[model samples]
Target chain A: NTGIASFEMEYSHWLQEQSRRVSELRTALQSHISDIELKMLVESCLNHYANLFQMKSDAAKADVFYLISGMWRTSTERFFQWIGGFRPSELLNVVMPYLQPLTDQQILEVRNLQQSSQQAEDALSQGIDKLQQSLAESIVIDAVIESTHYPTHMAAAIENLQALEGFVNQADHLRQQTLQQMAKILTTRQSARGLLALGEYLHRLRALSSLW
Target chain B: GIASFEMEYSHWLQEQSRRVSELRTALQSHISDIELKMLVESCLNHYANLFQMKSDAAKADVFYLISGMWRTSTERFFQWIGGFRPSELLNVVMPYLQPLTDQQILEVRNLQQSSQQAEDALSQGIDKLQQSLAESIVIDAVIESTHYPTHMAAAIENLQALEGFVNQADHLRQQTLQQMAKILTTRQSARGLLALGEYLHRLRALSSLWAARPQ
Candidate 1:
């Protein structure tokens, strides 16, 4: 069987197990007296399942998008009680490998990030010697996307799928800023540990960004 | 000697009156078309009259901060309306001020991100939240033959004010960033330098803080 076929099979089985798990979880979650931990657990499970289904959709090997989307809907009713609660990004990161496909635009965005990150590193190296707060001394890099209003047509066309790209790009930019800020601080330290940690983290991010 | 002094005083008075007339004409011309300008002028005059004030840095700082936040919020609204919104970066940057302690800001941001990502997972969560809800509503509608709710509406409406906080927080964060950037670019006061240093420190600490959060 092809990889796609194999993935679909595995995903389908996973879906079946997830279905059973949620059914049990929902029963427990909805029982008359649920505590904060129970609610958190239910929400956490729901989050995991959502990411799993989202990965299945991203795979696009079969028609899982509708199936998963429907699953999401049904789950929301039971789980909406924990509205405004949280799970974590690490959970999403855990499933990133499965979501590496589906959107070519996403793939390109990640690659561009990798390139820009390298450029940032190079600039840091060159500027470190002369790096004072002076305008001439400081290296200035413009944002990849400028701040501007979206056109009327775009406003009208905005939907969930379209919004994902914008949100994902924003996440990337924030992550980059955070990383660069870290690198700047780490470089000032005289220890290999902090420097190593910064380098490794950037590399990991770069790799993850290019997952597709 | 008295005649010469009188002549000089008269000339000074004439020059002052001419300058005042010119200022009045220019002010009238500037306020002709803009209603808001007229309102602002009135307010400015009232404040000036009450305080009998000259220019001060405190007044300038307060004005700049408010104006910056307003500009950022307006820009965000326009962007959102245009369907080209910058959602997450703004959310991340919105919490910190450049003048604040870097480590503390990072700690708070890490918590915020942890909370947000958690919410995102829950909202988008597999069969629990999004999928299940979408299924029930869409399927029920399909069977009942009624109109379906919009896709993003559930997440937007039901997610509470966490999203709203993220957006508003970003506006404030950028206000501080803009002020810091202005300081760096202008080489302004030591205050600006201190602010930039704080921002840089917070940025570094956030990653570790995020990593350490409970999943």
Candidate 2:
């Protein structure tokens, strides 16, 4: 009815369409499709999607409170969304097995990544706990209530939201960084398989959540 | 004159599109309680400001807005206040509630009850306001035969009345959203926002699709 500078609806469609495309690439990887094109394509997809998130977060920076609070997913989807969107053990315990034949150098790096990833998980979580100390709010409200209507002194609440926004992006930045490093140390094909599995894994989480 | 005003909405929509797409990205990323809270905090303010945008835009052209005769095809299609039904706003939210316990579910049901009531109250206000507006127009017609004199007393009053409706529409959204923000966990709020951001993002994109492929 009014105006929004208005990209949300179309942007929504883009991401909604994103998952299906992910599956397509996953299928491409699984099918033993052309290596050269698909590898670049998968990497391109990863970069594009990852890039948007950081870019988009900044775009919605002013609205950090609502976004982190979530207006965009099924509860089931969020259920799997715990702890910064991925688990470190998932890399070592989960994705690492699927990656074939690591070199002695590759092997050492991947294992080290696992240790570092796991450590960072807790470290980042520790960061979250610290933020909560600042963020603590449990007041109340009167309308189509969603979350617990809590707050700090209003200014305090605002500052924390900003910081938390910082944290999420911080968390996300780590995710991309991890993704790239995992890709970097491995051979191209190995990383491709990993991303496919990873993408497929993420999509399945969403798919099941959709069923819910 | 109105051309520039129309494009203003284009800019606003793109801004939200950018913000929302970012939140959708969060859906893929892991967010702890604090991280989730932070994202939600930023995203909710988008709408919080959204309401104010509605309030401000209404100041310019409450009638066209109310008429659903605004600039973009997207606006015309989804049209409620600015884009969605206040009551239906919960449709985007409840899925993230992930309510498990008897106590919380009960609270949710109760909150939804109020939310729906709040929604219906807004609708009822608008439904009647439209009638009152039309009724006045008809009355004005008969007086059109005469020299309209004292009508300013009534006519101008409706103008402010419409403005108030627009005003309250803004207030109601923030009140509901702010209160809701308080009630949920940061984790839950994060999920809720990703849900919300995704919902609207897709919605706008849908309108965009129609614009492109309207054949």
Candidate 3:
């Protein structure tokens, strides 16, 4: 059975939320009035745009992080520093800074684990459910609906804005599945760094929710 | 800890300095008075031969400055773009062309009012000269359309050239301003390229004025 069906469902929901955010920002920026409300609205719109850019950047970063982690886990050879020039410098940088804190937390969780595999699966499922709920409540949908009167060009801009949200959801759901599958693999792993890397990567997934 | 060599930093600095100097020289050389004078003379002679203007000494000097201003101004414009990026060059040139256009309109009106008693032949000659310089200046805009390759390093190099163009354009504009001020203060008007020269001054202004229209 393909493990991707659940992943696709989760991601589609995420993309819809992101689209709502983009539309909201676009509608705010299209205001032409000179009032204080317009200025504040534009500023808020700018903040949303910045958030969307950072969210997209983070999602792309997560994909790279996961791919490298998978490659490193499946190998026994000393890691080549250059594989098509996709060096793992960024992943190492992310991992190194939090290794100590992560080790401490993993140790605490390990003590409570009668079945660590089941525990991680439950946690992953919970996280996915929370993400779905958040995506549904995204404010960008109302913003887009409010922008119906904008000029043709402005309306198109709003559409592009909302489209970015759709990208976010798709990326997030794929990321969630990757994490869940990775958790399953880690539970069976008897090796030293293999499970540790999985735990750290999973923690990184949790941090991604802060992106929206 | 191992000591790291400074790499090629010194050579890089020197190379950059040399590039900047070349940009400055390219921009500066265009505004030299000798070249400006020669261009003015060439334009005047071309017009004089075409329309058979009276080549009296006084009329010749008037004709020369008018042609000179157009030649000098147009030279500065193209040179400015050569040393700068397109957007920055347009920004610098746009505002400048506005007043120049206004001055041309004013000069045109003044010439028509003052030369009312002159023969229709003089009017036809002046009209031809204005048309020639205006067309010449417009055609030179094509040279300023040279495209630069994109990418960080190339863009930066193009930007430096743009900076050089800005500096050069400013200098040429100042020189033009000074010359016009002196002419006005001295109040010594004569003939040669007089009609065409005055017309040149005004027509060139229009070029600048139109350049600034978007702003």
Q: Which docking category, incorrect, acceptable, medium or high, applies to candidate 3?
A: incorrect
Q: What is candidate 1's lDDT per residue for B61-118, written digit by digit as tens?
A: 3222211222232121222211112223323234323345565456445645654454
Best by DockQ: 1
Predicted candidate 2 versus true structure: per-residue lDDT over A60-127, tens digit per residue = 45444334433344432333343335454453445565576777888888888878877777787678
**Model 3: CA > 4 A from native:** A1-152, A187-212, B1-215
Q: Higher TM-score: candidate 2 or 3?
A: 2
List fnat, each candidate. 0.00, 0.00, 0.00
DockQ of 2: 0.01
Q: Identify the superior model by lDDT, candidate 1 or candidate 2.
A: 2
Docking quality class, candidate 1: incorrect
Model 2 chain B poorest ten-residue lDDT run: B206-215
lDDT winner: 2
Best-to-worst DockQ order: 1, 3, 2
